[PDB]
């Protein structure tokens, strides 16, 4: 999942409603 | 470098790399070039074995530039 | 004829390589006949051959290596020639080298060691227990570390000898003479848990730490970690 | 002081060190990479390229015979190597690695060589993963880092055994069609790009009688715009 990129200083790197984020994924809402 | 040339002269002999335009005649030239090779062997032996039979200061100076491409030093 | 045989130059190589000076302490200046001197005076003069240059570059970097080096390895090639009073000649200056910084000498000097405890056991035997047991405690330090060099290079002598040795000079095989049992008592070795060098979410965190517990379990100290991280 | 020896150039003092020592440094750079590659990948080029180097050297003379002597430090840096390539393979290590200037100019050889013989990775299936990473990635490299990019492939060509028939290049011919098309709008215009055909004199050379065959194309189209 993890994808090397170059970073902006030109090394690399291993890169890859928030209430109602909760809410949907609470189980009560379900 | 004289040195050298001739190691790896005798060494291209050794792996069969023999001159180009020698490779019953070169039997002749191999045996003859062995016997050559011994011959320098000899004559360089017997020439080692001739050789061979403040001042820390100095000696770490003369020590420290032992650059063999500036003469005078070596 | 019989150029192979009696190479008038043998002596002469160990009288030169005898003739350093082993005892300096390379402090603030070094002996004019010191040996590392000596191997500082070879691999500046190689620095300079080097810069003076296509083949011989080759050559240089493949066959050369170093100058010091040069008459051990050439003992190393006559080794099934030399006489018995050459190998004791020979074995003081062969064991004083092994603690050289340049692989390459002490790669030949152990070379050379190992055959001279082929040849003459006994001087080399005495050598040994005069060293171990010398009064002088460095002398037993570096007698320990010589022996470590000699187990290195252990594997290093047949290539140094000769393209075509192990037919001629030969060396008595390890005389076995009981056998283990039919089967092997116990396990050979207890294999190292996740190897680096071996090439293979509630899961993968499982995984993560089965992974660290074995890692943690297992000893990397008990291994040989540079002989099983050699391919073949 | 000790009396050492010093590199007249620089000053600095020359240092060599056993193959127990430069194994066992090579070892725990393999295990830093393997345990921890977020932390590594910074650092992964100069580890790269600083192993690959002891890989080129041979510990005796005797390159007819395999160094099979146990220590070999030269063998344990393929083992390093192979390892490294195999686990950051999947991480994107191969475009990643290609995009960038590699100031040693003998690495790519060494990393061609070293997996040549690799079955679980091999020299040619590590070129055919760097085109299918290079070919499925959204945005090619920019006409700068594309230079670069050929100029590495191409150096990766010229150490890999062309001629050797294996199941790939019948798959290697496809990725590298699909990849030269988009080259013409990636590429600078005033630059020289003598590396695409350096690539494309080394495809030529495949003992495959049909993968060139249809290669030729996209080879003509490229050519006309270079
Ligand atoms: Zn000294």
């Known amino acids: 999942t993890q994808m090397f990129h170059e970073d902006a200083a030109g090394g690399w790197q291993l890169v890859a409603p928030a209430c109602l984020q909760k809410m949907m994924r609470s189980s009560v809402f379900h | ?74 | 004829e019989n150029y192979h045989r009696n190479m008038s130059w043998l002596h002469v190589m160990i009288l030169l390589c005898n003739q350093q000076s082993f005892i300096c302490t390379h402090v603030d200046y070094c002996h004019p006949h010191c040996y590392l001197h000596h191997s500082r005076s070879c691999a500046r003069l190689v620095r300079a051959i080097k810069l003076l240059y296509s083949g011989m570059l080759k050559y240089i970097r493949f066959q050369v290596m170093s100058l010091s080096p040069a008459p051990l390895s050439l003992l190393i090639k006559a080794a099934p020639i030399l006489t018995e009073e050459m190998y004791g000649d020979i074995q003081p200056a062969a064991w004083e080298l092994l603690l050289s910084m340049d692989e390459h000498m002490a790669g030949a000097a152990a070379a050379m060691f190992l055959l001279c405890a082929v040849k003459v056991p006994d001087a080399v035997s005495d050598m040994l227990m005069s060293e171990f047991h010398h009064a002088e405690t460095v002398q037993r330090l570096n007698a320990v570390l010589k022996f470590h060099t000699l187990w290195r290079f252990r594997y290093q002598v047949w290539p140094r000898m000769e393209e075509g040795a192990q037919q001629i000079f030969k060396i008595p095989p390890p005389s076995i003479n009981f056998t283990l049992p039919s089967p092997v008592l116990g396990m050979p070795s207890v294999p190292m848990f996740d190897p680096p060098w071996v090439p293979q979410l509630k899961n993968l965190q499982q995984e993560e730490e089965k992974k660290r517990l074995g890692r943690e379990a297992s000893l990397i100290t008990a291994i040989p970690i540079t002989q099983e991280a050699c391919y073949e | 002081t000790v009396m050492a020896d010093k590199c007249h150039d620089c000053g600095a003092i020359l240092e060599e060190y056993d193959e127990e020592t430069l194994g066992l440094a090579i070892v725990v750079l393999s295990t830093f990479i393997h345990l921890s590659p977020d932390l590594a990948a910074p650092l992964l080029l100069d580890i790269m390229q600083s192993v690959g180097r002891l890989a080129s050297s041979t510990t005796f003379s005797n390159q007819a015979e395999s160094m099979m002597v146990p220590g070999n430090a030269a063998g344990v840096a393929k083992q390093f190597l192979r390892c490294i390539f195999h686990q950051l393979a999947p991480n994107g290590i191969f475009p990643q690695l290609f995009q960038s200037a590699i100031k040693d100019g003998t690495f790519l050889r060494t990393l061609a060589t070293s997996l040549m013989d690799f079955n679980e990775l091999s020299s040619i299936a590590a070129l055919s993963q760097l085109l299918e990473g290079l070919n499925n990635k959204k945005n090619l490299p920019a006409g700068g880092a594309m230079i670069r990019c050929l100029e590495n492939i191409a150096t990766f060509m010229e150490a890999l055994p062309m001629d050797s028939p294996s199941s790939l290049w019948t798959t290697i011919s496809n990725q590298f069609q699909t990849f030269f098309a988009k080259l013409p709008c990636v590429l600078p215009l005033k630059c020289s790009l003598d590396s695409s055909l350096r690539i494309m004199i080394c495809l030529l050379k495949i003992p495959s009688t049909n993968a060139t065959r249809s290669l030729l194309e996209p080879f003509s189209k490229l050519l006309s715009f270079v």
């Open chain 2, 1 to 74: 470098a004289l040195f050298l040339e001739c190691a790896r002269f005798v060494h291209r002999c050794n792996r069969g790399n023999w001159p180009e335009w020698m490779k019953k005649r070169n039997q002749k030239l191999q045996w003859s070039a062995a016997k050559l090779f011994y011959q320098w062997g000899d004559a360089i032996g017997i020439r080692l074995n001739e050789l061979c039979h403040e001042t820390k200061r100095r000696l770490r100076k003369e020590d420290e530039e032992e650059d063999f491409l500036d003469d005078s030093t070596v």
